[PDB]
Structure 1
């Protein structure tokens, strides 16, 4: 894909260059490839596209690239295969380019290491370096008129200098993932670290791996369990405590009929349901969110707990402990003492002294609201929320916005499009749909 000059009026600008935007770039590449679409042989003009990414290079959840962590999803659900297995951007073709395809085949697994899947996506992203501006953190999207709004100005701050630059585009995609969700009761402190900063921030805080640190973990989903488990290996003499509101870690549902909710063609079914039915369906399938844990990991943690029981029958004396049905009422963290004191109570309708508290409570996916505040008056009268259509384009007042201008949301549409919306599950197929939604008419010539 060839670059567009910074000051030209773009056809599409995408905010963020994680897997969701990367899937759009790949699908646009594939749509322009005469090998993949026969009609693309007669397309001599590439749309003017640009991506703004805050990081200095492509990276995927590097704070949680914990040792031995695996993908939670089959590699067939990579960024291209479910749309076109012939794509050059498939995981298997990436392995072939690295000389690793037979070696991966002998693993007999559908679940690559997360480190490996990140490298796969890094390898894909490098092929889009002419249209990705790294180190650009978008701060706002502003209306533009050339009395109907027909373009948008996207302002971004360069991470190295702090300077604000502006780009004009007819269409915008917001694909910025999630922001760390912290319980409101917790204070800010270098010893309280969210799961998104585990690998990147915790080793600097606790530098001596042999010290008997007391480390608490708040949560009961996949990241909490991974952090609890990894800490016991990384700090072999530590005392770790898992604080959970629930009565037990719960396994993710890997059964085949249930997992059909992640099928790409199921987005059509989910979207067509009423709000009441969508709301309840998202709970009747709670057992496959990031609120649950891979069975294998639950079993490994249980086995580790059992071995403590063999050595000592008194669970309160264990080096590593799980405290179910608890909530944090208070954190004391002021003073020269290097440990904080955490006060715990039952979560139905006790104090720890810790060197650190890892908080694995997931993410908010509302950061697009701040970015879009200066265009929210273009929504239909009476709307206080952005409403995405089936093709992820947000509803606009047609008398205020030209039909050739628009804004799409990616990754924050679980309520309308289903649990798969924030995952890798449907990115390949969705990237293709996005190309048809945004560029279809333009590509028709």
Structure 2
């Protein structure tokens, strides 16, 4: 793809260049490839990404961590296995395909899958501006005296220089993933760190890997379990504690019938249901992604706890402990020592104390950051509508009398409520990328 000068009106501007945006780029490439599409002037496109280079959840690239989905659900295969952007073609290009085959696994290390996506991302370097944090989307009128919006201005702050840049586009995609969700009862402290900053910020706080630190982990999902388990290897002499409201770590449901809810074709079926039925369906399949741990990891942690029991039958003396059915009621963190004092009580409706050097908080993400960006375009929604309403094709509903048919805003990754549990995942990216290219560039590609 060829670059577009900053000053030109773009056909599409995409906010964020994580997997969701990358899947769109790939799908656009493939749609424009005569070897893949018998139909195939390039669209004027640009991706803005706040990170300085492509990275996928680098704060959680835990040593040994594995993908939780088959490599077949990569960024292209489910749309077109002939694509140059498949995982298998990536491996072939790296001279590693036969070697991977001998592993007999569908689940690559997260490190390898990141490198796959990095390899994909590098092929779009001409159309991605890195180090650009988007701060706002503003409506624009090519005829300022009219009452019709027909473009948007996207403003971004250079992360290095702090300078503001503006780019104009007919169409916008917001694909910015999630922001760290923190419990509202915990105070702000450098020793209290969200899971997303685990690999990034914890080593800077706890510099000496040999020291007998006390480290707590709050949560019971995949991130909590991965951190809990990794801390035992990273800090071999540390005393770790897993704090959870639930009675137990629970396994992720990847059984084949249940798992079909992640099929690309099931988005149609989910989207068509009423608000009530969609709400009920999300709760019925909560065990497939939310606050759950991959079985193999649960078993590994359980085995480690058993080995501690072999060495010492007194659980209170174990180096590493799990404290179930607990909630944090108070955090003392103004004292003269390195350690905070965490007060615990029963998570049951109507206990002990921990002293820790750090508290890792694995409480998931919020996916409402698009709201702050779209603040100035809110008035273009149908009268009295106080929430963004994405259509099946991910384009938000706007007042047809206020916005031209050629102008629009699409949301990606934040649409679980309307599109299902696969929305925030990698599960349907390849197919969704294809659908997005058709939605956004359909008229243009139809001409050829």
Alpha-carbon shift at residue 301 of structure 1 (Å):
0.5
Q: For 2:441 and 2:378, how far apart are their aligned partners in 1? A: 24
Alpha-carbon shift at residue 83 of structure 1 (Å):
0.2
- Is 1:99 aligned to 2:116, yes or no? no
Alpha-carbon shift at residue 444 of structure 1 (Å):
1.2
Q: For 1:192 and 1:160, how far apart are their aligned partners in 2? A: 26
Q: Please list the CA deviations of residues 124-154 of structure 1 after superposition, one character each: whole Å capped at 9, or x if unmatched.
A: 0000001000000000000000821000000
Q: Please list the CA deviations of residues 347-397 of structure 1 after superposition, one character each: whole Å capped at 9, or x if unmatched.
A: 100110000000000000000000000000100111111010000000000
Bigger mean CA offset, 203-212 vs 11-20: 203-212
Alpha-carbon shift at residue 421 of structure 1 (Å):
0.2
2:42 alignment partner, SS class: coil
Give the total of aligned pairs.
Answer: 441
Q: For 2:384 and 2:319, how far apart are their aligned partners in 1? A: 56
- Is 1:201 aligned to 2:201, yes or no? yes
Instruction: State the match for 1:223 in structure 2.
Output: 223
Alpha-carbon shift at residue 337 of structure 1 (Å):
1.0
Q: For 1:194 and 1:128, how far apart are their aligned partners in 2? A: 31
Instruction: State the match for 1:73 in structure 2.
Output: 69
Alpha-carbon shift at residue 216 of structure 1 (Å):
0.1
Instruction: State the match for 2:134 in structure 1.
Output: 138
2:39 alignment partner, SS class: helix
Q: Please list the CA deviations of residues 299-334 of structure 1 after superposition, one character each: whole Å capped at 9, or x if unmatched.
A: 000000111111222212211111111101111111
- Is 1:117 aligned to 2:119, yes or no? no
Bigger mean CA offset, 202-211 vs 51-60: 202-211
Return the match for 2:57 from 55, 61, 64. 61
Alpha-carbon shift at residue 290 of structure 1 (Å):
3.8
1:420 alignment partner, SS class: coil
2:80 alignment partner, SS class: coil
2:203 alignment partner, SS class: helix
Alpha-carbon shift at residue 335 of structure 1 (Å):
3.2
1:11 alignment partner, SS class: strand
1:240 alignment partner, SS class: strand
Taking structure 1 as the reference length, what is the TM-score of the superposition? 0.98
**Structure 1: gaps spanning 5 or more residues:** none
Counterpart mapping for 1:113-192 below 5 A = 113-145=109-141, 147-192=147-192
Counterpart mapping for 1:345-424 below 5 A = 345-349=345-349, 350-424=352-426
1:343 alignment partner, SS class: strand
Q: For 2:42 and 2:218, how far apart are their aligned partners in 1? A: 48
Q: For 2:44 and 2:221, how far apart are their aligned partners in 1? A: 41
Alpha-carbon shift at residue 336 of structure 1 (Å):
2.7
Bigger mean CA offset, 143-152 vs 57-66: 143-152
1:128 alignment partner, SS class: helix
Runs of 4+ in 1 over 6 A off after TM superposition: none
Q: Please list the CA deviations of residues 204-231 of structure 1 after superposition, one character each: whole Å capped at 9, or x if unmatched.
A: 1111111110000000000000000000
Q: For 1:438 and 1:293, how far apart are their aligned partners in 2? A: 37
Q: Please list the CA deviations of residues 97-123 of structure 1 after superposition, one character each: whole Å capped at 9, or x if unmatched.
A: 000000111110000000000000000
Q: For 2:30 and 2:436, how far apart are their aligned partners in 1? A: 13
Aligned CA RMSD, in angstroms, stands at: 0.7
**Structure 2: gaps spanning 5 or more residues:** none
Q: For 1:313 and 1:379, how far apart are their aligned partners in 2? A: 63
2:156 alignment partner, SS class: strand
